[PDB]
Structure 1
Amino acid sequence: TGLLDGKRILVSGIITDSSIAFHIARVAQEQGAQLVLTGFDRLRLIQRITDRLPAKAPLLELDVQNEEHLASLAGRVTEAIGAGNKLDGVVHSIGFMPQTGMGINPFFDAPYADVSKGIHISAYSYASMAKALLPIMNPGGSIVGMDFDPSRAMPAYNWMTVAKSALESVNRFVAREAGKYGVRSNLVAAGPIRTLAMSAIVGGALGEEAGAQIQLLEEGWDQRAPIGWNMKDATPVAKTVCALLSDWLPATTGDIIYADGGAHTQLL
């Protein structure tokens, strides 16, 4: 018994083998899921990465800003999994924000063109993915997205914080639409994980006073967490996501599950 025996799950957002999306996929496969992967921009490079997953799985190009890709997605998936099958799961593990909206760059200096692009990719896309894919989702199934607790402002995360606050609201509306199909929609609010986006968008959003000032702030998780937090281990987050994909949280929708070692429950 896999936790996800014979479930068909789409997984977006793999780019390196540190990606949260990757570990979600590895764990979903270990628990008997047959996957359909999506990737953005660097398909050849993503394909080397996905070969390292425990099982082969079809790979589809999806740039959540591409009108045509979303219009096509529903059909490209049906053709990848077998005509007359549907998905039981969907994982949105996608984010972006320009350099201007992040790190040491003044919050007031981010121009709206740039903020808008981030909100498009990191928040609105959760709705446009749900729109494209609900028609090919079974009753019982689960949409899951990735969140970083935005309830309080923090240094550096800046306009991404705002995108996550938007995503949180988007998720509650998707839950309403998804409800008509017997589908749940939830976010996992993870603690920090060494992934590409952490480094090149955030660590590289500061340079010098930079990446050791990542470090201290992120022990505003390991310290607070009553069971601790390990930034190098995505397994706990991946498992938490699989739990939402499974049949074992069947009464939770529009909601947020914290995979953060409990840190958000503790002030110190």
Structure 2
Amino acid sequence: GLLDGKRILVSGIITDSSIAFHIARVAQEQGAQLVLTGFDRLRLIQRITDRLPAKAPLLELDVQNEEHLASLAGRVTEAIGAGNKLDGVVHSIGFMPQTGMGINPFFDAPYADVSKGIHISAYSYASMAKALLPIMNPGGSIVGMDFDPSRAMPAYNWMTVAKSALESVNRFVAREAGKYGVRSNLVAAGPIRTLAMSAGAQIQLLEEGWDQRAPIGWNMKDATPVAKTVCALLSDWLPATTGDIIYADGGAHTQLL
């Protein structure tokens, strides 16, 4: 039980292909007691979370909603029992409107759309940390999901910009979280077939290039390797790593080709 008796909040489950879902699954297999947050289709999310190996309370959280953030810590402590604190927080939340992504030209995305995407994808990592650090134990771990944005690439467009912002936000969260003995890190995943992927020739070349570049290969169908990596960061086995990015991408980013 890598996470034996750790209390861990996990956001961002929308389907059972969600990366968050597999993080939640692997964490429970490893003895973690979870609290879960879900955004919009709460009834649907409850049905999806029923398929996890264990029961976990489900709280409503719209990261754009200031009231939800203000009430979050109180709602969490109620669910885990007063006197108890969190050892773990997982941010697995991303969004960018269609105008900011894919076939749509980079220059045509209006700021309102980009701003919303940045709000949800980058700024929310800080506001979740603000809301939850007060109910976190020393030795604890905050973890967010990243996609390496250090080089530009077709299609990913303004979401790349959002991820660049996130990485920077992560380094500042690490400063604040350090005052509580809490670590903050990001996991940079290779591409994964999720619901979000749903929203062409260049993206396929990027994927296949992925497996080819990855010295141990990469399998877009399998979220388990990134779930494990996130669990490794939630654990006590990376105690001197903070403000940082761990690459769970088959090693692809270390190879030019």
Q: Mark yes or no: TM-score above 0.5.
A: yes
- Paired with 1:155 and 1:84, the residues of 2 have a C-alpha distance of 49
- Paired with 1:217 and 1:240, the residues of 2 have a C-alpha distance of 22
> Alignment partner of 1:223: what SS?
helix
> Alignment partner of 1:10: what SS?
strand
CA contact (8 A) 2:154 2:203 kept: no
Q: Offset at 1:192?
A: 0.4
> Alignment partner of 1:188: what SS?
strand
In the other structure, the counterpart of 1:99 is 98
Summarize deviations over 1:4-62 as a string: whole Å, max 9, x none: 00000000000000000000000000000000000000000001100000001000000
Q: Offset at 1:219?
A: 1.4
Q: Offset at 1:177?
A: 0.1
Q: Offset at 1:220?
A: 2.1
CA contact (8 A) 2:154 2:202 kept: no
Summarize deviations over 1:191-210 as a string: whole Å, max 9, x none: 000001111xxxxxxxxxx9
| 1:1-268 alignment, distance < 5 Å | 2-199=1-198, 211-268=200-257
Q: Offset at 1:70?
A: 0.1
- Paired with 1:71 and 1:110, the residues of 2 have a C-alpha distance of 31
Summarize deviations over 1:72-112 as a string: whole Å, max 9, x none: 00000000001010000000000100010001101000000
- Paired with 1:220 and 1:75, the residues of 2 have a C-alpha distance of 46
> Alignment partner of 1:213: what SS?
helix
Greater alpha carbon shift after TM alignment, 214-223 vs 26-35 = 214-223
- Paired with 2:245 and 2:208, the residues of 1 have a C-alpha distance of 22
Q: Offset at 1:216?
A: 1.7
Q: Offset at 1:212?
A: 4.6
- Structure 1 regions of 5+ residues with no counterpart? 200-209
- Paired with 1:215 and 1:114, the residues of 2 have a C-alpha distance of 26
- Paired with 1:16 and 1:53, the residues of 2 have a C-alpha distance of 12
- Paired with 2:82 and 2:231, the residues of 1 have a C-alpha distance of 25
Q: Offset at 1:217?
A: 1.2
Q: Offset at 1:211?
A: 4.0
- Paired with 2:175 and 2:227, the residues of 1 have a C-alpha distance of 25
- Paired with 1:163 and 1:198, the residues of 2 have a C-alpha distance of 16
Instruction: State the TM-score, normalized to the length of structure 2.
Output: 0.99
CA contact (8 A) 2:142 2:234 kept: yes
> Alignment partner of 1:129: what SS?
helix
CA contact (8 A) 2:35 2:56 kept: yes
Identity %: 100
> Alignment partner of 2:185: what SS?
strand
CA contact (8 A) 2:146 2:187 kept: yes
Question: Root-mean-square deviation (CA), in Å?
Answer: 0.9
> Alignment partner of 2:69: what SS?
helix
**Which consecutive aligned stretches of 4+ in structure 1 deviate over 2 angstroms post-superposition?**
210-214
